Amino acid sequence: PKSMQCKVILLDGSEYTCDVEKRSRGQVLFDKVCEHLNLLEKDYFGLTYRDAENQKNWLDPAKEIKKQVRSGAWHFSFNVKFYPPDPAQLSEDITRYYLCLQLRDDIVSGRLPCSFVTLALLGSYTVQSELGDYDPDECGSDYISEFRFAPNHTKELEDKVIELHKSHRGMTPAEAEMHFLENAKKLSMYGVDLHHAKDSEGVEIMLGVCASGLLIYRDRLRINRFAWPKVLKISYKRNNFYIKIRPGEFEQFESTIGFKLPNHRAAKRLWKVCVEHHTFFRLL
Numbered sequence: 001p002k003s004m005q006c007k008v009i010l011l012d013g014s015e016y017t018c019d020v021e022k023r024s025r026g027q028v029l030f031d032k033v034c035e036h037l038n039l040l041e042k043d044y045f046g047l048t049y050r051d052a053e054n055q056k057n058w059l060d061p062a063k064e065i066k067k068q069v070r071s072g073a074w075h076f077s078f079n080v081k082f083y084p085p086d087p088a089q090l091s092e093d094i095t096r097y098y099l100c101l102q103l104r105d106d107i108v109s110g111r112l113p114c115s116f117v118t119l120a121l122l123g124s125y126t127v128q129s130e131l132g133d134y135d136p137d138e139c140g141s142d143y144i145s146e147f148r149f150a151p152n153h154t155k156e157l158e159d160k161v162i163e164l165h166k167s168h169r170g171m172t173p174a175e176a177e178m179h180f181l182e183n184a185k186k187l188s189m190y191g192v193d194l195h196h197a198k199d200s201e202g203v204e205i206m207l208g209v210c211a212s213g214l215l216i217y218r219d220r221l222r223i224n225r226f227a228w229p230k231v232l233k234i235s236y237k238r239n240n241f242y243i244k245i246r247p248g249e250f251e252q253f254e255s256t257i258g259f260k261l262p263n264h265r266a267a268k269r270l271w272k273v274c275v276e277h278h279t280f281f282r283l284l
């Protein structure tokens with residue numbers, strides 16, 4: 001029985017290596033990673049892999065690994081797939097912990113934009129969770145944390161992290177992680193998967209996929225939002241992605257909004273992430 005070596009980048013930046021039978025479905029490798037992580041609330045998470053153009057793709061747990069990675073290396077990342085709108089509802093602290101690690105990467109990467117004060121407040125909870133109570137002995141007036149807090153670090157941000165860290169004395173890691181999530185969950189780009197697209201007139205937009213629905217970012221004055229209930233049907237054809245928007249009460253016909261994606265694969269990817277969010281958040 002021939003087995004392939006899999007390498008998984010974990011959310012703490014460490015590598016997990018295992019073997020699966022070469023005809024294995026994605027669920028087989030995912031179950032192994034989740035057992036390694038002691039993760040029970042697995043529904044929020046998945047494995048990603050990068051293709052030739054270094055684009056992210058979700059490993060479909062129902063399909064053969066080999067038919068997805070195809071010509072590529074069996075190299076994956078462990079990631080949050082469905083960001084819970086209310087992380088307090090999750091049953092386990094260890095679930096909230098992995099969600100925190102994902103969000104820390106969302107912030108440092110700049111996928112999740114954040115004000116100065118929110119960067120410092122999130123960083124202060126991470127430090128409280130990881131080092132415990134503030135200790136002056138470690139930090140002088142010139143202190144810079146090993147922790148990455150932001151896409152661009154400044155001495156002013158490092159100082160503000162410490163000032164807020166002083167206020168969290170006696171906070172346990174679980175408690176600091178819950179405060180982290182209560183702040184992060186309110187950010188306008190929390191849990192938003194962004195896709196480059198063009199509208200029916202060729203104007204560059206972004207489409208955002210999240211728990212609540214689909215967002216169309218046209219300009220800073222113009223953001224269209226379609227709550228999942230308002231979306232009757234999703235489709236792709238060639239490089240195009242279409243959504244069928246319910247008629248208002250007393251209207252005869254649904255409206256259709258079409259978008260141009262860069263290529264056929266980018267249209268299919270957007271379609272599948274929309275279908276998965278629609279199913280998940282319809283049941284949650």
Ligand SMILES: CC(=O)N[C@H]1CNc2ccccc2C1
Pocket residue numbers: 210212213214215225226227228
């Ligand atoms: C205050 C607000 O606009 N809340 C939700 C409502 N609806 C909605 C629909 C699609 C994507 C995101 C959202 C955010």
